[PDB]
């Protein structure tokens, strides 16, 4: 017996392929705990989920629970140092993060498997004795405000909060979750509120053990993990807090049959149909919402989308249940709109109700349920292994909704067929309780009201009862047939035995002028899955802005045509990715091996015999036109990254050049581009997973024959197979490029300190220095000086050349952010000198563990191999190679590396800065900086500078 534990077990149901060991328990204080034992893991992890969220925010202090989340990382009474938590994890190959939903506050971290207890101890203190230091309070409020600021011009966020502000006004659903400097600092002070206590009271009142769930993953035995949690979580006291419920729906009858005309930031056209439904979480074993979601949201033949897309009204559709909170959910049907789909919205919604009455007319189909059941059964059995950090984080959240034994299976497996639940949910999808929202730029100027927090321009109409009556009286449309039998459902899961000549790293098994085939039979995971990666090289893909446009259009027209066919496969765990690269095309087929060659053959064969529908060419072109112009509205820090990539690469077409060339892309000229693109190619491929060398050679060869036959493809010449170089910066030089963001009101900046080529030596000097400055960069530029919410530091790798980059999104001007960063680098230098030689070799093993963390799923391993192939470096034993060299490094080696390359005095300093201005434009101080040559023309700048060589392979 153990008094600190209320109950144990029984046995946590897991996949047969899962060799981790589990144990569920409920502590005496009511904390539901899952213990994961995995002796093979390189990183240990833990997570806690409090069942209190932003819905429990005080009406007078919006975003308090969100703000409280940020403050827990900033010190406890047992660990008073403001960054003890983040510094500990940083020095032990770990990371941490948290989020705040309406009903949940979730904390999680990972760390080196040897220091789980050390990390967990500091972590547990967050719930026990947090400081909420006031000096930390008036600082971190800016990080929250800067966070909201990035979301203020986000159409997704504006709409998200808009739905909240159109329901019951003081239903907790209406509350502003994020909070800003105003709601958190300004207004409380005006109202005489002390924030530190209303933090402490909220933490006292709501952070009860009664509302908590814990998941810990480590190498330790299940019993060793039991003693660990009990030791440090038995102290969380049980206030016995009643779990918040919201029985009454935020959308009452006054909020139904309503129309919302909304003005967006980007140029988009979308129709949002919403149905209020009760909380279906209770019915998870049968899951009626999923059944309808699968049918309504189906994209196969005879489906709703299939016909709205045929009339040229929509292009995409998402439908199904959207969680609201405990007591209420939503059923949604969202489509994007074409230009004339915007003019036939009444008819579009009519077709929706016509499909709904098709479902009602033929009733619940058990065979469908069975298909959804078997698919979830297969998906669970052969489920890819998850990384500890995200795994513990998710389980900790779902420990509140399901019994301990079902937590791994509950979200996946279905058990009961409930036609009644099917039909009653279906009964609440009627026109009389509908909510319609239209998002288009065409409503600009015609709007009357304005959303409070984001400033959303829109207009609210009551849907004319004339219209409701036409929706209620919806005949059966003969063009809506229920999805047929899914024929991509795998039946062959036999893991083929490891061959005698099997290799630990991908072996080159075909080296012709036409193709280069890399292959490795899976030797670690043993699932029925396989990844087929292909890179098609062609000069005609990126020769000019015109062809880069046509290359995009060609592949997006192709995917559009394959959608009905391929959708069935994705449901059956067989997906494909097809996109245009600067070197040609990229195709990747992932999923179960069984029906995998069928899909691939269908892809390539459609690829080489594509017949273009002109009115799908019109629609997609128009969408692509908007997508390029919508780039104007992305965040300043992304713009800063976009410009740098343009500056430092040999050949790169700007998005504004892509628009001018788009108007001349006629249908006959596109249809003539395709045969010429496929005229001569070179295919570098990686076939990895549950397949043999012979199958792989057959797959690759069947791709070639299909091309040699329908497109008459013959090989490309070796000289045409070279990649793009990176601009070589002059020693002791500094360049600055400056642009403005017409949409966002924050400034962005990327600083790039270029080092020389990627070498086994040069790589690790960069990645070690980056490791050391990782935590202090976040600590200084954000936690202390609060420049912005987005503060990034780390290496930059492109075209075989590396360097150090700083990314900051702030309100302060870039020229100021420049100094702060330069001041920080001086700060780091005199910190590398006064760090103990053991504290140095702690950073080394930290980096070492991160590099030597082996993958845990197939696609993760495939990514690492594929990286070496497209990098044209082919260094498959990079980790063991570079990690070994890393340990050789002394503290002085890094010192002179800074002094020579990165320092302000540096003989070889190569600095480029991108300054994206905002819409309208003691501490440590910086050294005096030289006057930078301002780049006023991108191509002119590149024209006047040398180009780096390309890295020699292997």
């Amino acid at each position: 017996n153990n008094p600190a534990i209320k109950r144990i077990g029984n046995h946590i149901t897991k996949s047969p392929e899962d060799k981790r060991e589990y144990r569920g328990l409920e502590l005496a204080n009511g904390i539901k705990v899952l213990l994961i034992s995995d002796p093979t893991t390189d990183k240990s992890s833990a997570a806690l989920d409090v069942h209190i969220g932003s819905l429990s925010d005080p009406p007078n202090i919006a975003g308090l629970s969100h703000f409280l989340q940020h403050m827990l990382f900033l010190g406890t009474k047992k660990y008073p140092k403001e960054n003890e938590y983040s510094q500990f994890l940083s020095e032990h190959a770990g990371s941490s993060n948290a989020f705040t939903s309406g009903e949940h506050t979730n904390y999680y971290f990972d760390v080196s498997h040897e220091h789980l207890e050390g990390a967990l101890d500091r972590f547990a203190q967050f719930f026990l004795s947090p400081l909420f230091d006031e000096s930390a309070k008036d600082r971190e409020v800016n990080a929250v405000d800067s966070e909201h600021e990035k979301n203020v011009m986000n159409d997704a966020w504006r709409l998200f909060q808009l739905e909240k502000a159109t329901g019951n006004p003081k239903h907790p659903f209406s509350k502003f979750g994020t909070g800003n400097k105003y709601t958190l600092e300004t207004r409380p002070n005006q109202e005489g509120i002390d924030v530190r206590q209303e933090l402490l009271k909220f933490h006292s009142a709501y952070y009860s053990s009664n509302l908590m769930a814990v998941v810990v993953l480590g190498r330790e035995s299940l019993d060793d993990l039991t003693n660990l949690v009990v030791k440090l979580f038995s102290e969380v006291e049980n206030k016995n807090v009643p779990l918040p419920e919201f029985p009454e729906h935020p959308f009452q009858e006054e909020h139904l049959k309503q129309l919302y005309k909304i003005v967006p930031i980007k140029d988009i056209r979308n129709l949002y149909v919403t149905f209020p439904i009760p909380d279906l979480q209770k019915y998870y074993k049968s899951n009626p919402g999923h059944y309808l979601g699968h049918l309504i949201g189906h994209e196969g033949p005879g489906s709703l989308l299939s016909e709205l897309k045929s009339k040229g009204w929509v292009n995409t559709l998402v439908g199904g249940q959207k969680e609201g909170a405990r007591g209420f959910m939503f059923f949604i049907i969202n489509v994007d709109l074409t230009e004339e789909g915007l003019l036939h919205v009444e008819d579009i919604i009519l077709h929706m109700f016509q499909y709904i009455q098709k479902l009602r007319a033929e009733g619940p189909q058990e065979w469908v349920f069975q298909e959804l059941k078997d698919l979830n059964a297969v998906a669970f059995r052969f489920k890819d292994k998850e990384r500890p950090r995200g795994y513990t984080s998710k389980i900790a959240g779902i420990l509140h909704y399901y019994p301990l034994e079902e937590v791994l299976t509950a979200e996946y497996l279905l058990e009961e067929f409930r036609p009644d639940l099917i039909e009653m949910v279906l009964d609440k999808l009627r026109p009389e309780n509908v909510r319609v929202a239209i998002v288009s730029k065409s409503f600009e100027g015609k709007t009357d009201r304005t959303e409070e927090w984001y400033g959303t321009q829109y207009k609210q109409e009551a849907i004319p009862d004339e219209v409701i009556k036409k929706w209620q009286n919806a005949d059966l449309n003969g063009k809506f047939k229920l999805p047929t039998k899914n024929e991509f459902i795998p039946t062959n899961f036999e893991i083929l035995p490891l061959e005698k000549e099997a290799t630990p790293y991908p072996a080159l098994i075909k080296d012709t002028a036409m193709s280069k085939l890399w292959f490795k039979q899976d030797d670690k995971f043993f699932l029925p899955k396989a990844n087929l990666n292909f890179e098609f090289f062609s000069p005609f893909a990126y020769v000019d802005p015109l062809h880069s446009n046509m290359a995009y259009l060609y592949l997006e027209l192709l995917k559009d045509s394959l959608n009905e066919y391929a959708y069935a496969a994705e449901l059956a765990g067989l997906s494909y990715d097809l996109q245009n690269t600067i070197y040609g095309m990229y195709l990747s087929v992932k999923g179960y091996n069984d029906k995998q060659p069928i899909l691939l053959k269908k892809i390539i064969e459609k690829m080489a015999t594509f017949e273009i529908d002109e009115k799908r060419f019109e629609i997609i072109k128009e969408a692509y036109m908007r997508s390029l112009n919508n780039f104007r509205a992305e965040q300043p820090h992304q713009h800063a990254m976009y410009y740098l990539r343009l500056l430092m690469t040999e050949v790169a077409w700007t998005k504004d050049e892509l628009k001018e060339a788009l108007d001349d892309v006629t249908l006959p000229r596109l249809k003539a581009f395709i045969p010429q693109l496929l005229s001569r190619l070179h295919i570098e491929a990686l076939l990895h997973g549950n397949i043999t060398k012979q199958a792989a050679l057959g797959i690759m060869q069947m791709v070639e024959d299909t091309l040699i036959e329908h497109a008459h493809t013959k090989p490309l010449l070796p000289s045409q197979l070279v990649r793009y170089r990176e601009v070589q910066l002059p020693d002791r030089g500094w360049f600055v490029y400056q642009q403005r963001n017409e949409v966002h009101n924050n400034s962005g900046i990327e600083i790039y300190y270029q080092t020389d080529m990627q070498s086994t030596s040069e790589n690790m000097f960069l990645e070690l220095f980056a490791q050391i400055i990782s935590e202090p960069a976040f600590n200084t530029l954000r936690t202390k000086e609060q420049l912005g919410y987005i503060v990034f530091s780390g290496p930059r790798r492109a075209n075989g050349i590396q360097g150090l980059r700083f990314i900051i999104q702030s309100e302060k001007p870039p020229h100021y952010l420049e100094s702060r960063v330069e001041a920080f680098l001086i700060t780091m230098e005199k910190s590398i000198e006064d760090m103990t030689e053991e504290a140095f070799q702690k950073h080394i093993q930290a980096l070492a563990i991160r590099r030597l963390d082996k993958p845990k799923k197939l696609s993760a391993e495939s990514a690492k191999y594929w990286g070496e192939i497209i990098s044209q470096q082919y260094n498959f034993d990079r980790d063991n190679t570079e990690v070994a060299y890393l340990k050789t490094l002394t503290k002085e080696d890094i010192i002179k590396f800074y002094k020579e390359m990165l320092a302000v005095d540096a003989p070889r300093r190569h600095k480029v800065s991108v300054h994206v201005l905002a819409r309208e434009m003691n501490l440590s101080q910086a050294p005096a900086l030289p006057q930078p040559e301002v780049i006023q023309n991108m191509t002119e700048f590149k024209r006047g500078l040398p180009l780096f060589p390309l890295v020699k392979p292997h």
Binding site: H66, H70, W157, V318, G319, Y789
Partner: peptide, 11 residues
């Protein structure tokens, strides 16, 4: 497609 916004600490 069937379906399947939370404020975070870091990006």
């Amino acid at each position: 497609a069937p379906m399947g916004f939370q404020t975070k600490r870091s990006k």
